[PDB]
Design a protein around this ligand. Structure first.
Ligand code: POV
Ligand code: POV
Ligand code: POV
Ligand code: POV
Ligand code: POV
Ligand code: POV
Ligand code: POV
Ligand code: POV
Ligand code: POV
Ligand code: POV
Ligand code: POV
Ligand code: POV
Lengths: 526, 115, 115, 64
């Protein structure tokens, strides 16, 4: 208070390297202004002493384009490592300003403070902004939640959908779904204006476009299986049905030309979606874009089976069989339409990554390690002149140990070995290490992976279904998109219309007298 | 018994029939015509025989013969080993782990459902 | 304290800091600079690093009498000290030991199978 | 604990002129005529606020 009254500057910026670092362990970025330092270090008395001074420019922008409200979003953390004061400093500065000027500025990236909280993945600040309600009468225009009517426990409310619905570009719903840098993207779709907004899109137009994609793709694999199993099994009966090799006016010719038309429409469409989304992470392609590669491989192998047939290379069976086997394993994508069979495909994806790949690495070490040591012990099989042993080579001793694990065949120990006791000692030691140890420890380790991911498999499923809905919404034309629009115009304040969404609720534990509503008559109008 | 059949067995039997009929065509569509040996050259001659030979490999009966009449002997082994990993290693061992959750939940309620 | 395996006394000694000005020479933790939440600090490595003989890092690792030898390597001047040794010279000497021993078992298998 | 034994076995094996090159920490003037060869660890603390006394360098940046 002595230095400010003596004539210090209250707008000086700190533009140094230490005050704007390149790694987060070398300096401390706070917003470069002496207003932003007093708020980012939890000092409510110096903030209130600075805003009353008439020289304090409260809408200044630093070297990054950030203002006072962008700086509080950047230094925010969770509840565990930071108490609550970023949420309380965001409220004090906004109610003192009194307009929408700070909420709608854009920094050098082109982001408002609402959009920046979704890009960086701040959960507690985004929950505060999307449902903010001011009861005090002269400052009610700054809210995004408005009580429409209330009578006893039953009340109704409106949520503002101005910059959170996907009508504009870089919406808050689009940033959360297509974000790969953050990790809590599946805990941010449980917020109350976003959970109801994804439910309304599924009920009107997304559960019907998803059913039509299932019928066009199930009819595609029937007409590829039947033209590859009822093939003319003769080299003298050379013309395959595909590619229209012979014009003979063949009945059911629509089945084998439907394959060529539909296979190119996938390989063109899926070539674009790999071209736009360009990842570098190995973890991203196994978690977001797995089913874009495997629909692209299955469409290439059908097209490449046509050019090798017209050139007559007798290699086309090795590409059609890999198209039928891969095609019926791709039908497991269409299980996200159900909650019961959708959560079951999440647990398959976690067990293969955590438990099966570790088992298959130790098992191949034992199967190829004991396979040489049994094949190197068998003598030459010429004294019986034919078929004295089944462990004659390395490629035969591996096959006889693979058949002993799954439990097929018979066990013969009277081989042509020169050391019959050492042959039994290496064969019993293989049974203990695999049949007793590894195949029973795999069942015990799957009991841990199931017990952990069963508390999260629902919210991972709703993140996967939310991506499918926003893909169908970018596909349909403009005159469909205006018909399938959510919410209605509501006169909120004096000359203000904001296109809100309505959610009803019942509350019993907290009683109060109702002030600050919109309609006196609590019924549904008309 | 009534809770495990509703929650765990019916989900297993839907994924298993998809793999058994999916790999059953792709092995039956690869075997050549059996006229060059004039009798009984392969056991995967038809769709209704290749399904039966994969059902017997899951429960562990019979014998495994890989010297079929296939025109591509390496591609026949690649589709047969991939079937063993997906069912014998993955699905039949994940079923035991998922029954450990259903038993651990309904054992706190199975007395009052009985009364 | 490292030989007998006393966890709470060893945590006190390795990070001891006296703020009172005339007795600041008795500390082993010193605040180098601090600005707001971000701060830096220095940990004394006089008799705990393996430059001398019977160091504190050597007594904890090669001790067989105690049982909590694996809970004593999570202390803050010892956890970072084992990470820096792995990043400079120990992850490369460990990779060369793998290649000299994997090449050894190939040239013993092939001279015993193609006998 | 098992990986910490492997690191200290490789450190007793390499000769002396490698061991001086792979040395950790730097000399820091701690007090009046005292040099102790310390190790540096950074951290961020949010819950406890205080005014900072008893530091070594006034200028908080990395030197050079
Ligand atoms: C199915 C057969 C073909 C598979 C493709 C080709 C095979 C190459 C494999 C490629 C994919 C590897 C994993 C993908 C994602 C990486 C992270 C991960 O989840 O792995 C997990 C385990 O994973 C392992 O431990 C694998 C170790 C054995 C690999 C070789 C055996 C493969 C079988 C073939 C036979 C031998 C092959 C010979 C080559 C040596 C890491 O453990 P986590 O901590 O629980 O995970 C958390 C995620 N995190 C680490 C990112 C935090
Ligand atoms: C999900 C799974 C995905 C990946 C699975 C992919 C592979 C899985 C399946 C693998 C099956 C492999 C067996 C068949 C191979 C063909 C034959 C061959 O090439 O052998 C040749 C060399 O072999 C030798 O001569 C000696 C072997 C030396 C190296 C092996 C040491 C094991 C180390 C392993 C530890 C490191 C690995 C650790 C783990 C990574 C000799 O052949 P032959 O004996 O003369 O055969 C003649 C046949 N005939 C008699 C009828 C004419
Ligand atoms: C045994 C063989 C004959 C069976 C009869 C005929 C078969 C048709 C089946 C009829 C009965 C279906 C269930 C009855 C009760 C419904 C709710 C339920 O409990 O299901 C549960 C799981 O159930 C599934 O997920 C089934 C999915 C696969 C169905 C087809 C495979 C059947 C095997 C035949 C092979 C393919 C057949 C081809 C046809 C596609 C729902 O999951 P939940 O949340 O844990 O349950 C809570 C209850 N709740 C949802 C009400 C809240
Ligand atoms: C608890 C369980 C309750 C329900 C279980 C009930 C069923 C379970 C059991 C089922 C056993 C079925 C096999 C035997 C059927 C008889 C033969 C037949 O009709 O095939 C005919 C058509 O087949 C073809 O020509 C090609 C097949 C095309 C469709 C199959 C694609 C798989 C997709 C599946 C994915 C979708 C399903 C997803 C999951 C629902 C040809 O017959 P054939 O080959 O010429 O035989 C001649 C015989 N002979 C040579 C001796 C003369
Ligand atoms: C519980 C068990 C599980 C572990 C199983 C592990 C597998 C262990 C396998 C054991 C048996 C295999 C070896 C037997 C030898 C056969 C003879 C032969 O022809 O040799 C061939 C071997 O060619 C190969 O390498 C096989 C090709 C498939 C490799 C593994 C599948 C990849 C799975 C990835 C998919 C991941 C799915 C994703 C799921 C997450 C080579 O031919 P040849 O050298 O010329 O031999 C001469 C013989 N002849 C004269 C008649 C021609
Ligand atoms: C009330 C609301 C409903 C109206 C809305 C419909 C209007 C829409 C108008 C135009 C939308 C643009 C069409 C794109 C065509 C490309 C084809 C293609 O590649 O596959 C597409 C087919 O999936 C669909 O898009 C189905 C939607 C309708 C298709 C066209 C109408 C034909 C109706 C004929 C009437 C039939 C009989 C009618 C019976 C009465 C999408 O493929 P995908 O599966 O998404 O991609 C793979 C999955 N992946 C993303 C993971 C990789
Ligand atoms: C390019 C080769 C692919 C073929 C596999 C080769 C094996 C080795 C390669 C990779 C190793 C395999 C590890 C799988 C890792 C992802 C797990 C997963 O997808 O789970 C899925 C279960 O569906 C399955 O994946 C189970 C069936 C196995 C693959 C089908 C084999 C086809 C036959 C082979 C013959 C054809 C040969 C084809 C040409 C070689 C569902 O999981 P999710 O929850 O939906 O996660 C996706 C997230 N997302 C939805 C947002 C995207
Ligand atoms: C079936 C198995 C047989 C064997 C298959 C073998 C392979 C099996 C492979 C995988 C097994 C999984 C099966 C795939 C199912 C996908 C479909 C789906 O997602 O259903 C979903 C919707 O779908 C509907 O039910 C739509 C209604 C049907 C009538 C549509 C009329 C045509 C559209 C008119 C055209 C207009 C004009 C045309 C011109 C433009 C289910 O929805 P829900 O859960 O009930 O909703 C509850 C919402 N809740 C979750 C929030 C609570
Ligand atoms: C005896 C039943 C056998 C299946 C009937 C098959 C023919 C039916 C024809 C018309 C009836 C349309 C209304 C049915 C809607 C629900 C169906 C259902 O209960 O299945 C259940 C299990 O099933 C599955 O999840 C596996 C997928 C295959 C079976 C479902 C097909 C229904 C799709 C319809 C259109 C495809 C038509 C395809 C044409 C061949 C669905 O699980 P759920 O309970 O919905 O889980 C979410 C609900 N929840 C939030 C409350 C938990
Ligand atoms: C730390 C200091 C270490 C210093 C020393 C290090 C050096 C190591 C020293 C010696 C090494 C061991 C002996 C190798 C040389 C003789 C090999 C031999 O003749 O084969 C013998 C078997 O061989 C075995 O008995 C299995 C070898 C493993 C030892 C079993 C201990 C496991 C305990 C598990 C408990 C079960 C125990 C019983 C399991 C059987 C007999 O074979 P044969 O075929 O009968 O003989 C041929 C004659 N005929 C052709 C007419 C028949
Ligand atoms: C994203 C961008 C994608 C763009 C490209 C997309 C396009 C896709 C491109 C090419 C597709 C793959 C090749 C198909 C064409 C050749 C088929 C062929 O000849 O069969 C070959 C086997 O075939 C295999 O090896 C199995 C195919 C699956 C790939 C294995 C990877 C799994 C890793 C698991 C690790 C184990 C790996 C080893 C597993 C064996 C050999 O068969 P053959 O019988 O010996 O030949 C006949 C000669 N004879 C009769 C005299 C013997
Ligand atoms: C930047 C830092 C890197 C420099 C540091 C290296 C300088 C080091 C100089 C001298 C160190 C003394 C060497 C001891 C030799 C004895 C051999 C022996 O018995 O095995 C030893 C080999 O493992 C090693 O020690 C690898 C270290 C390098 C070996 C020598 C350099 C040759 C490089 C040639 C260039 C090749 C091509 C280069 C390509 C460009 C150790 O065996 P072990 O596995 O530990 O014991 C078994 C495990 N157990 C303990 C549980 C029982």
């Amino acid at each position: 208070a002595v230095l400010i009254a003596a004539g210090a500057d209250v707008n000086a910026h700190a533009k140094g390297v230490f005050f704007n670092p390149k790694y987060q362990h070398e300096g401390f970025y706070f917003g470069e202004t002496p207003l932003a330092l007093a708020a980012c270090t939890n000092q409510p008395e110096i903030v209130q002493l600075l805003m009353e001074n008439e020289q304090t420019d409260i809408t200044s922008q630093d070297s990054r384009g950030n203002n006072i409200l962008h700086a509080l979003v950047t230094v925010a953390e969770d509840f565990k490592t930071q108490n609550d004061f970023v949420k309380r400093m965001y409220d004090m500065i906004l109610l003192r300003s009194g307009n929408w000027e700070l909420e709608t500025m854009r920094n050098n990236d082109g982001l408002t403070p609402l959009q920046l909280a979704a890009k960086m993945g701040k959960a507690e600040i985004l929950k505060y902004i999307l449902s903010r309600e001011i009861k005090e009468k002269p400052l009610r225009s700054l809210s995004r939640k408005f009580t429409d009517w209330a009578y006893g426990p039953v009340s109704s409310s409106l949520y503002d959908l101005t910059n959170v619905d996907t009508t504009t570009d870089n919406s808050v719903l689009e940033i959360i779904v297509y974000n790969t840098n953050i990790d809590n993207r599946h805990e941010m779709l449980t917020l109350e204006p976003l959970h109801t907004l994804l439910h309304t899109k599924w009920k009107k137009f997304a559960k019907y476009m998803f059913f039509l994609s299932f019928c066009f793709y199930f009819f595609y694999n029937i007409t590829l299986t039947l033209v590859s199993y009822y093939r003319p099994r003769e080299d003298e009966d050379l013309p395959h049905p595909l590619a229209l090799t012979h014009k003979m006016s063949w009945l059911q010719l629509l089945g084998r030309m439907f394959v060529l038309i539909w296979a190119t429409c996938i390989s063109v469409k899926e070539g674009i979606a790999i071209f736009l989304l360009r990842p570098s992470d190995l973890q991203s392609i196994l978690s977001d874009a797995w089913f874009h590669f495997v629909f692209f491989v299955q469409a290439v192998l059908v097209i490449l089976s046509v050019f090798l047939y017209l050139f007559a290379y007798k290699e086309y069976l090795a590409c059609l069989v890999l198209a039928m086997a891969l095609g019926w394993a791709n039908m497991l994508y269409y299980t996200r339409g159900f909650q019961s069979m959708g959560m079951y495909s999440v647990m398959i994806q976690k067990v293969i990554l955590h438990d099966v790949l570790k088992f298959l690495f130790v098992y191949i070490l034992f199967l190829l390690g004991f396979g040489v040591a049994l094949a190197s012990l068998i003598e030459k099989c010429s004294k019986d002149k034919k078929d004295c042993s089944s462990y004659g080579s390395f490629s035969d001793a591996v096959l006889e140990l693979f058949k002993l694990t799954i439990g097929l065949g018979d066990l013969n120990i009277q081989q042509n070995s020169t050391y019959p006791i050492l042959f039994l000692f290496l064969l019993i030691t293989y049974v203990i290490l695999t049949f007793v140890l590894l195949l029973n420890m795999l069942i015990a380790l799957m009991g841990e992976t199931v017990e952990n991911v069963s508390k999260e498999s629902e919210r991972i499923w709703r993140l996967q279904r939310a991506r499918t809905i926003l893909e169908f919404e970018k596909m349909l034309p403009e005159w469909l998109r205006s018909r399938f629009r959510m919410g209605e115009l509501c006169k909120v304040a004096d000359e203000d219309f904001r296109l809100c969404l309505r959610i009803n609720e019942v509350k019993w534990t907290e009683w109060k007298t109702h002030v600050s509503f919109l309609n006196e008559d609590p019924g549904p109008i008309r």
